Amino acid sequence: TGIQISGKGFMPISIIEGDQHIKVIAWLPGVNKEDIILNAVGDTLEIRAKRSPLMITESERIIYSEIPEEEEIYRTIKLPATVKEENASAKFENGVLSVILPKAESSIKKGINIE
Amino acid sequence: TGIQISGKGFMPISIIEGDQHIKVIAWLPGVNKEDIILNAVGDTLEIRAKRSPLMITESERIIYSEIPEEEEIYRTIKLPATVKEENASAKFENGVLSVILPKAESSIKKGINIE
Amino acid sequence: TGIQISGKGFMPISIIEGDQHIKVIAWLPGVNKEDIILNAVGDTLEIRAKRSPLMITESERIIYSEIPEEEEIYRTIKLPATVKEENASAKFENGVLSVILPKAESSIKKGINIE
Amino acid sequence: TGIQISGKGFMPISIIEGDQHIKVIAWLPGVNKEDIILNAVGDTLEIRAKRSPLMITESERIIYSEIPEEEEIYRTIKLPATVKEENASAKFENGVLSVILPKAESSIKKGINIE
Amino acid sequence: TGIQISGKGFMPISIIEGDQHIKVIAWLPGVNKEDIILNAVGDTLEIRAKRSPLMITESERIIYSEIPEEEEIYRTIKLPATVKEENASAKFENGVLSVILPKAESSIKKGINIE
Amino acid sequence: TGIQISGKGFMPISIIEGDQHIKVIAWLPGVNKEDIILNAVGDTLEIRAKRSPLMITESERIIYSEIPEEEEIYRTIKLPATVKEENASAKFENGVLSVILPKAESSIKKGINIE
Amino acid sequence: TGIQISGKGFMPISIIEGDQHIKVIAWLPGVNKEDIILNAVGDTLEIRAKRSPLMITESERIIYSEIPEEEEIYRTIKLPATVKEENASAKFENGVLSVILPKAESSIKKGINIE
Amino acid sequence: TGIQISGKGFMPISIIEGDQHIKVIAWLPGVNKEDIILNAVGDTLEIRAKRSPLMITESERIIYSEIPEEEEIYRTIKLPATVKEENASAKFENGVLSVILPKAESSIKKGINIE
Amino acid sequence: TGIQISGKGFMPISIIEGDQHIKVIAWLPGVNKEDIILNAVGDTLEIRAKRSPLMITESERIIYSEIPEEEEIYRTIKLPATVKEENASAKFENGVLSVILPKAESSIKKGINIE
Amino acid sequence: TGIQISGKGFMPISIIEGDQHIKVIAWLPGVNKEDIILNAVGDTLEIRAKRSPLMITESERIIYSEIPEEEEIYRTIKLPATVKEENASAKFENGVLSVILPKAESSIKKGINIE
Amino acid sequence: TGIQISGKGFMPISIIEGDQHIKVIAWLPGVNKEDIILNAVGDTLEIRAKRSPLMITESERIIYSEIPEEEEIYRTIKLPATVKEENASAKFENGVLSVILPKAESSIKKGINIE
Amino acid sequence: TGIQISGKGFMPISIIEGDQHIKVIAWLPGVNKEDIILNAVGDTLEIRAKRSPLMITESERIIYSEIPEEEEIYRTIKLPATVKEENASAKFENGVLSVILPKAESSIKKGINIE
Amino acid sequence: TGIQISGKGFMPISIIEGDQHIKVIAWLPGVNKEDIILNAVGDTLEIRAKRSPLMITESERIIYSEIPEEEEIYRTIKLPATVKEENASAKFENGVLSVILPKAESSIKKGINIE
Amino acid sequence: TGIQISGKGFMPISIIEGDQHIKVIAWLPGVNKEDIILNAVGDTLEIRAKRSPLMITESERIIYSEIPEEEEIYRTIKLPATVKEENASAKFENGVLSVILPKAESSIKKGINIE
Amino acid sequence: TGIQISGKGFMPISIIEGDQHIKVIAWLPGVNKEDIILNAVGDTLEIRAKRSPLMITESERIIYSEIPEEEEIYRTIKLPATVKEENASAKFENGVLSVILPKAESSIKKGINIE
Amino acid sequence: TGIQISGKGFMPISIIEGDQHIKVIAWLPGVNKEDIILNAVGDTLEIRAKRSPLMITESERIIYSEIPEEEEIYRTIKLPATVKEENASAKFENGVLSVILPKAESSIKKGINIE
Amino acid sequence: TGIQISGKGFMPISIIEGDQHIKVIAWLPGVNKEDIILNAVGDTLEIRAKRSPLMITESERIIYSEIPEEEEIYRTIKLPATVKEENASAKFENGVLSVILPKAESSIKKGINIE
């Protein structure tokens, strides 16, 4: 399986391969649904997102923090099969994005008989 | 500011202190609202959560993954002020939890005049 | 959870916290029941014990040993809650001591509603 | 004295040799008497045991622990003398096991006169 | 020759290239014939297998072992030529699997004359 | 348990001890049944085998290999009990050899009563 | 994004990807416009240039220098998309070269709807 | 320029790229012309050769040597352009082999005008 | 055997000593026969050669190279015997030079009888 | 010769093997004759001793010392032959102990003729 | 195979095990036949030898030497089988000693049938 | 206390100082009484001794040894007080030598009163 | 004394120089007398030998070995004097070769008178 | 070419070998012509020189210096050919000495024909 | 004394300061007098030179060399006093250049009286 | 100057070369004149000596020593010229030996004229 | 024994102590008898010497040297006993000086009786 991942930001990724489709799971906590861009062609997928920073009053101040302040995040993924992007689907729930991509006919493997 | 953090799992935390309240922000992507337990007394707050693992069919398999598989997560936080837990509030949205805690009368600071 | 452990000897310890009580488990192999002293006040517990050494005849001698020969052992434990020591209980069986300590009213945490 | 020790788990051991017998002392805190298996032949002794794990309610949780969670423990010991296993005896008290093994006639040493 | 190997488990591999075919040899000791899955398309081959673990009675126990206990094993191989999977063959004997894959017409090399 | 292993080649081994017998499991992928020699006496077992090397045509060549080319393999094993070799049995299946060896009367251990 | 850069000399490069085109910026200080060669096909671009060395009189001499004296410079770039070279354009100004390359129809990505 | 070299033996290589062809130069001292195999397809070239070892009489012996004794040598080369192998040519002289390979129409680059 | 080698360039050497002659083998790939100078006197041999560099057109360029560009090469060899240079011979074939040198009468060794 | 030495204290040892007996020499300076215990069976010998410490008056004090103050000393020795302990003898003189042990009939070696 | 080697001097050793005998080969250059002592019992063999030192005249002196000057040499070998020393044989030729030792009936291994 | 010790061999020493005398204890195991030389003058003492080496028969040999083979031993001791050597005494028993040396009048210390 | 040693194999050497001759001693255990070649001229000596390898039956196998398996051995020695090879002699006994070489008249040193 | 250089001082050297002569170049700045000694015999050359030190007045002093103050300098050179010293010549100019040495007839090399 | 030296090549320098002048000595072996340029102004001096390289015939070659082949050499020196360049002088002899520079009136130091 | 020194012992050496002779100085303190052997031939010199060891009475002993106890000492020296040993001379005084060796006619160097 | 050595130069020293005298041996090669100064008082000895340096002619020069060129040498020695310098004696022979010093009455040691 040839996998290429590139981009910037904090975004953990899981890839699941079946016999006839591919599933991608991405973690995007704090991002609105209307600020995500998803694109795909051939064997390549592209995810882009923005998250708004934490807004404080001037009376308030941050005394402890582990949450990063990158505003723009993106990933480019090269997949081990050619997909059909016209039949794909996606869902966003509790800050998790799930993409389902059906495989093309020329990438579906065939069985060999053992004796 | 005396801050104590302990627990287990993956859970980034931000603490914001104002003049009359304290705000806590926690990242919990993939957790249902009905699986969170929030408790507070004195100057101590406790957050407990469960996230369901990723369910696959036996035809499918995971070829790449960066998402951790801990099932139980919790944090215990000791705060720099005594709060009133009977007036507190919380919100859960896009996988982010936000807690607002009002301060007690014996922890509100008073000004000194400079000349 | 603020935990402080100090003392001397060999004595493994487990601490279990519930919603309304605290349980402590201690390993004391070879100690008689009438040679244990247990005390508690506030948020502090104290365990003291003696074990008799191995008595041999002058015809006999020790050719191999991994068992330590400390005679006095004790632990002092500072707990994350204030307990009521007048309602506590303890049991000793197969060399294991188990202590149950009920929590005070000012240390019982209260729930916050999420919406 | 040729001594061989092997096995798995946590089990400290002491060996005492006299003129006509051998004594073995083992530390087994938390084990029931009916879950110990003792065997011996020739110059070899075998001890097997099980200890039940710590059972909690789902309201409770373990915040500190030094007690190990191995469930099966055993030791195999090769001794410096041939014993008679038909005359041996054993005792279990406060989590300590004590085994007494009489020596065979062909392993009892004889004195040489000095002048 | 571009060769890509990925997967999990213990499975040694040999690849042999001729003028008109490719041969793959894999070591699978302890696997039943009906628990192997072989697939191929384009220039990629996929081998999946399961081996049952070693079953003991509770009187018996394992005192020495060098054999690994992974239950699921697989390999994905990217080959230096495009093959025809409809003419391929495979054999399984003494725990060794042998796969023969004929080459496509567009991957058969042609000679150049030297003078 | 006194275990001695020596020899040459690639041959993983598992040893299982019961109350009245000993089992040995060996991995020999690629070896014919008629090329194995098994011997035993006292507390010692001996396994010898040959595997034929991989035969190629001069048009073919090996471009990748992880399979070793030792031709002669053997193991000598010293066991923790004296066996009866006249009652032993062996099986060879899918490249795995399994040997069952009954114990002699002078190596069967006897129980000691605990009180 | 698969990017391959090779060549020789001093030539800093920037690559900008849009939705429908690719832009390349190169730094070539001291090079005449009529000494640049630009070529492209498929997903590959090639830049070649010459710069004349610094000409001095024999009365003059160089007492300090940080400017390199390579005479031939070139870069070969492999791009993450297939372009149409018949619609490309280029500009040279103040020693900076800018190339605009339109994308082919088979490399333009398509959107997936999220719900 | 994507270049891949693999193989075994001693064989220095030079690659020259023009506008419409590719030239490869290889050093093979001591090899007969009738013991060289040259093949090419797509963007890949393959060179195979044998050299006879140095034959001595039993009266003679080698007291100093820097010449290696590998008998089989080969190289596989992946080129940065697709060639036409039906129009290629080769020459062998003084132990040097020279191969000329014409480029295909889809790999010939086109010029871009600068203004 | 006293052997001295000196010179410059790339030139591997083998020396073979018999009972009545000495043979020298040298690797010179790419050198014309009319550009070699061979000299010998006493116990010293001298080899000098030139190789023409690789000539390219200005459209062409070298993108990969392992072949060295030294133009002048020579070796001086001091031998373990005095030779007769008036009876020597040499051959040049496939880029390999072979020199045969007969030994003088004062360097031919004589046998000693063993009893 | 299989030799095993174990014990505690300061006691240098020499072992001398003849054709029909074994001699052991031990250094015990400062030990009374009536405080030594010597035992032997099979192929094992055991030496035990006590030495009284240095007694001072309270006016006196030790300003320099290299003599050790261990009070109990012992050695256990496993020999390379089976002896007859009923025919052994021992002597003590100037702080040196000498033990003579005759060999059993089954440990006396026999000669092989060379031709 | 349990092998124990001990002794002093320079004496290389080879051990060969068959089905019914054991062979030992020892290198003793410079030793007379009448100065070798060979003994064996049980599973133990003993070789003792003396070699005379190099005798020079006072006019002569040693300007270079690699030959050691130990005068007494011996080896003790513990074998992996019990032998019959009354049927053994030995030969001495060109400074090499060869010993043949037949095996006892209780050390000859028996075959196990595989199915 | 100024103490100087010098000499050669193995000889442990203890020095005891009182109010009116000095005691020296030396360990000499294996030395005859008639082979000791004791001398003293001023503040210096001298001990010289010989021990006979271990005498073996040519049938016997030493297979293990920790006892040193120095034949001559001596110590020179410079003391922190001037003694009277005409009133000194010495004893030899079980390999231990004890010397008593009375102090001179000019080295006896006098008390100072504290108030 | 100028000494040069070269060659291959295992062969220890001693060189002894007198007033009128030179002696060489070589260790060759396991070599037949008819397989040695000795030559000398000027100030150079040459020793060549072969030893047959250890021949086993297929029932037998080598379980331990320290004896090397080089088949061809030789040494070349350059001496500090010119010898007369027509008066030399050699002996072979118990695997040791001894060569005596008389000196030439031009290498015999002459005395200088001291006053 | 056997070259030996020895001596003391600062004197850089160049050696040039032709077909019939040898040239030596030496750097001697600050040396008068009448203070050089040149000698040669066989294959050895010897150069000796003196340079006067820098003379100052007592008003003057040296505040910086890199020029060395050795007064005597010499070199001894062993050459790779025997020369005729009766036909040699030398020149001294601008502090550089040049020596030309013709070769003897027995060191002039002769050509070997190649075919 | 402020001294600054810069430039390139091999040129050792000595600087001598008096009461009324400055002397500079430079080593230039192999340089012609008509190829030196000397300049001075203020407190700065500049020396420039060329040396011709060593010219050989094509029959000749350089087998050893320590003389450097830089062709252009120069030094710039900043002096600790202001000089009058219109009264300066220079000499060149045996490859050594000597420059005398008179001091200006404003750099001549004046004495202070001590009492 | 080719100098070779070899031998054993303590013997410092100085070598002085003139135009027509060679001088050697050696330090031999404690050696009698009648125990020195001096030899020379060609270009080689040989010095041999004995010194008697230090003789003590049994009442006396050595408490400090820096003088070495080698009894035999020798040096072999290879000189840079051929000498005439029939005209040599030697002197011995205060433990210093001085040897004068005249040079042969073929080693006397001849002058070359410089212009 | 308190020994103090100080001074400068090369001078090895040996000190021998008897019952009634002290002997000192010093190595002074190359020193005349009339250039030595010997002094002693109390427990201290002083040796002073001069050696003339090696005198050469200006035709001669030193090409190798290990002999040091210190001109003044001396040693001061503090002894472990008070001597009588009016009864001392000294000898000088072959470059070795020997001094005999009788002991005073207050340093002669007295014996102590052992029982």
Curated annotation (Swiss-Prot), chains A, B, C, D, E, F, G, H, I, J, K, L, M, N, O, P, Q:
Its main location: cytoplasm. GO terms for biological process: protein complex oligomerization; protein folding; protein stabilization; response to heat; response to hydrogen peroxide; response to salt stress. GO terms for cellular component: cytoplasm; protein-containing complex. Keywords: Chaperone, Cytoplasm, Stress response. It comes from the Archaea. One of its GO terms (molecular function) is identical protein binding. Residues 4-115 form the sHSP domain. It is found in: Cytoplasm. The keyword Transmembrane does not apply. Belongs to the small heat shock protein (HSP20) family. Homooligomer of 24 subunits. Forms a spherical shape. Chaperone that confers thermal protection to other proteins. This is Small heat shock protein HSP16.5. It comes from Methanocaldococcus jannaschii (strain ATCC 43067 / DSM 2661 / JAL-1 / JCM 10045 / NBRC 100440). The chain holds residues 33 to 147 of 147 of the full protein.
